[PDB]
Design a protein around this ligand. Structure first.
Ligand SMILES: C[C@H]1CNCCCN1c1nccc(-c2noc([C@@]3(C)CCCc4sc(N)c(C#N)c43)n2)n1
Ligand SMILES: Nc1nc2c(ncn2[C@@H]2O[C@H](COP(=O)(O)OP(=O)(O)O)[C@@H](O)[C@H]2O)c(=O)[nH]1
Ligand SMILES: [Mg+2]
Ligand SMILES: [Mg+2]
Length: 170
C-alpha cells in the first residue's frame, strides 16, 4: 500500500505531546488528556502531492532503559522533540531526548524537528532566538506550535516527513 512514516513525539511530561497528536489527527483541542496514556495513532495525509500514512507514537510515562523500550523507540523514522515555551526546564531537557534518539538509531543524522508548543500563552520563558539557535546547532528545523489554536501543528508534522524524505533521498 501507500508509504507509511513511523513518527515519535517525545519531550517532558506536560509539554503538550498528546494535545498536539489529538489536534493533528482529530482536529480538536483536548485539554488535560490522561498523562499516562502512551499509544500509536494513524492518519492518512497528502504532503507535497504525495499521499501517505502517518503512524504516530505519542510517548508517556517513566524514563525506562531496556532492550524492549530501546527497540520500540528504534522503530521511529522521525522524531518531534517537544518543549513548552513557558517551561524553561522542558527546553533544558531537549538535549537528553536527542541523545537517547541518536543512541538507539546509532546515528548523528536522525530526522528530527524541534517543537516549541503553547505559543498561544502569554507567559513565555524561552525566547524564539534561544530555540532557533538550539535547532541550528542540531541541524534541524524549529517550529512554534499551539495545540489549542492549531497554529503550526500540521507544519511541524509535515516538516518532519520532509526531513525523512530528504534523509532517504541521501
Ligand atoms: C530528561 C530526563 C531527565 N531524567 C529525570 C526525569 C525526566 N527525564 C525523562 N523522563 C521521562 C522520559 C525520559 C526519556 N528520555 O528518553 C526518552 C525516550 C522515550 C525518547 C526517545 C528515545 C528513547 S530510548 C529509551 N529507552 C527512552 C526512554 N525512556 C527514550 N524518554 N526522560
Ligand atoms: N494553552 C495551551 N495549553 C496546552 C497546549 N498543549 C497542551 N496544553 C495543556 O498542557 C497540559 C499538558 O498537555 P498534554 O497533552 O497532556 O501534554 P503531554 O504530557 O506532553 O502529553 C494540559 O493541561 C493541556 O491542556 C497548547 O498548545 N496551549
Ligand atoms: Mg500525554
Ligand atoms: Mg494550559
Amino acid at each position: 500500500g501507500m508509504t507509511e512514516y513511523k513518527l515519535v513525539v517525545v519531550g517532558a511530561c506536560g509539554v503538550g505531546k498528546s494535545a498536539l497528536t489529538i489536534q493533528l489527527i482529530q482536529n480538536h483541542f483536548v485539554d488535560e488528556y490522561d498523562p499516562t496514556i502512551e499509544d500509536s495513532y494513524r492518519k492518512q495525509v497528502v504532503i507535497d502531492g504525495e499521499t501517505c500514512l502517518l503512524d504516530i507514537l505519542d510517548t508517556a510515562g517513566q524514563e525506562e532503559y531496556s532492550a524492549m523500550r530501546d527497540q520500540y523507540m528504534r522503530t521511529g523514522e522521525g522524531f518531534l522533540c517537544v518543549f513548552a515555551i513557558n517551561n524553561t526546564k522542558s527546553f533544558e531537557d531537549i538535549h537528553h531526548y536527542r541523545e537517547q534518539i541518536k543512541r538507539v538509531k546509532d546515528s548523528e543524522d536522525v530526522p528530527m524537528v524541534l517543537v516549541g508548543n503553547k505559543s498561544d500563552l502569554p507567559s513565555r520563558t524561552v525566547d524564539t532566538k534561544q530555540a532557533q539557535d538550539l535547532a541550528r546547532s542540531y541541524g534541524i528545523p524549529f517550529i512554534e506550535t499551539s495545540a489549542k489554536t492549531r497554529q503550526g501543528v500540521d507544519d511541524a508534522f509535515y516538516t518532519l516527513v520532509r526531513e525523512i524524505r530528504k534523509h532517504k533521498e541521501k
